[PDB]
Every structure is written in structure tokens, then in C-alpha cells.
Amino acid sequence: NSSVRHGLTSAQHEVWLAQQLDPRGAHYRTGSCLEIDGPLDHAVLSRALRLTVAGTETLCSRFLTDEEGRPYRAYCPPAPEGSAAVEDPDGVPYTPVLLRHIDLSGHEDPEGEAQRWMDRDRATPLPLDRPGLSSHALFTLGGGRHLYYLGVHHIVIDGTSMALFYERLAEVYRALRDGRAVPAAAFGDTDRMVAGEEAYRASARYERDRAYWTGLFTDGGRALAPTVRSLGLPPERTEVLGRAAEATGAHWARVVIAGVAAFLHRTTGARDVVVSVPVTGRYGANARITPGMVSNRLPLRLAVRPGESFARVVETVSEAMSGLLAHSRFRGEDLDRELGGAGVSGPTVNVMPYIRPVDFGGPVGLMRSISSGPTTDLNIVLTGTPESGLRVDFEGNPQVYGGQDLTVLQERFVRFLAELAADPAATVDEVALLT
């Protein structure tokens, strides 16, 4: 069962090939965290983690190569709770499971020290040959506030899977606390998901999707671990996005994307603005419950003229998205290759989907991004909602932006964005932009 060689997803193959260029590099170390408003029992949480991990195949996997140099995924079960985890020199290695406990209460700046710790951890390489490609840490920030850090290698966990992990973790936690039997892990099968992709790449649908994207683009550097600047915005400042959505009839995420497009137009003055958007990569019941890495990104060609309202820009986004979602299965990476050069670049706008407050039986955890992945330019990451407040993270390529560049660009973008949301009828050229 540990001998079975599992196939990688298209997204996993991409990460593998890009990782073989810089083995020691930590460019694919990603992660998120849960801000928890109440005290949690570390011992129980450490126990719930092992149970959660054991039920999550992708978190128990290592990556190796066969006799052809081709990569494959190997399943390495974790040791039982309380076990000494004794390994034989020629036996199957256990998947280590560790929930670090870091008590930062009573310190000068708990939050800042925790952030420095997380940035330090994601700078650490995570060899694929070793099982358990994740790093966990529970911070105590005093005042009953905790912060759970989830660090991973991109190849095992995507954005969607982070949420799945969190909800499962809490589910297990509540079980052990109530003394109830732990609910059966309702996770999917990666093999079937992989087969689903293979079947697709052989279908005539793949040809039409590729044709659509190629023909749409028939007229800079390496992807690196981004420097991250986060900005917390309270509901008092984010509700306006919700009202812009209500008024324009578009989902608030479309409003943010239009905001970015308008921002790029104002700063660069380019008629045709390109902005990439992530897509789930999960098609079918099985895929949508199978924790792993199948995330994907596709470019939006947005034509923007200054003499048009913000509402019109919003429509242009929804129209372009219509054509994009109709061909979502096609890999953005494959598109960049068939076109050569630096491919289709520009900022990536990732408005993460709603995640219900993770309930630990009283205490509640809110998810916010630490690093969504490497970029050649910029990643704009949002979490939360217009009603409950937002976390705006600017993730920039360190060769393009500096920490201070990101903070400035981020600030003037949020002010500009809120300025647009306030009056969607206003012309793009007239909206106040801090320079």
C-alpha cells in the first residue's frame, strides 16, 4: 500500500518541474493562519492534528522518481498517537506530525513576533523526498487570542484545501472534547481526480479550450517567493464594496477585480489590461472534497477607456469572466508555454471565497493568507467579506517590489477601490487616485 505509485495532477506536475530547477529554494512554501479569539487546549489540538493528517492523504504523501526520472506520489501513513515512531533504515518512513506550541503572551509585540516566525518558517526549504510537507504552529498571543499557522509545500495543498483542512481539524477537535467518536473523514480520492484530468486532456473539449485561449492572445523574470504586506480593513471601510455589488448586480469579487483593472489603467494608461484569476480546478463531487493541489489561473483581457463608469468596467469583467469560466479546465501554465516568452503576465487577483468562522466549540478561528504562492509580478489576496471586514495582502516578487513599495501601492489601491465602490456611476478618469 506504500508501494503504490500515485499519479500527480497537472498542477502538481507544474510545481514538480519548476521545483527541480531550484531544489533548495523555498519558492513554493505557502501557508495561511487562523486567528482564534479564544483559548484552546494544545494537547487536544495536537491530538486532533494527527487524526486529521492521517485522514488527509495529501498531507501524508512524499514525492519520488521512478526509473525514468518521472515523478510519482507515495503515501506514508503517520505513526500512531503516543508511538515512539521508530523507523528502520530500510523501512517506510513515517509522516512526522508536530504541533509546535509557542507562548508569546507577555511579550512586547506578540503579533509581530508571530509574523516574523511565520516568515522565517516559509523561508525554510521542504525537500519533496521527505514525507509530511507541512509545518504547524499554535501561538498564544495573550488575552485568550491564539494564532494557528499552517505552512505547506505548494505541491500538496492549495487554497481550497487549506479551508478543508481547517474545518476538518476543528471537527476532530470538537469530537475529542465532547468525548464523541470522531466523525468519519469524508475526503475524496486523488487517483480518480487525476484520471479525471487525463480524460479531459484527451477529450475534444481540451482542444476547443486551448484554441480559445491561444487565439485570444495572438497579439519579468522567474516565479519567486513573494514579500508580503498585509492590511486589515474593518467593516466600516469594506461595506461600500457590498453596496457597489448590490447596485451593479455583480458579485463583490467582480467589483474588486474591476477595481484592480481600473487601477492598472490609471497607473499605466494601457487600453488592454491583463489580470489573472485563480480557478478551483475541481470538477465533480469527488474533486471538490479531495484535499490536494489542482489550483489554476487564467488571464482576463480587460479593455478599459477612462471615459467610462466603474460600473461599465465591472460589466467588462463579467463578460470576460463569462468566456473564461467557459474554458476553465485549460491550464494557464500551458498557455504561457505555447506562447513562449514570459507568457501572459500581470497581477493575479485572488478574492478568496467565503470561509465560515472555524468553530472549535466556542472559540472561533478566522482564516487569513500568509503566502498564496510564488509570483513573477504581484499577487493581490483578499479574505473575508464586505460585511465582516477584509484582509488585503499584497504579495510581490522581491525583484520587482520592496516591502515599502507594496505598502504604498496597497494603501493607494484600497483608497482608490473604496472611492470607486462609493459611486460606480463615476467616470474612471475622475475618481480620486493618490499618487
From TrEMBL:
The lineage of its organism: Bacteria, Bacillati, Actinomycetota, Actinomycetes, Kitasatosporales. It comes from the Bacteria. This is CDA peptide synthetase I. Belongs to the ATP-dependent AMP-binding enzyme family. The chain holds residues 4 to 449 of 7463 of the full protein. The gene is cdaPSI.
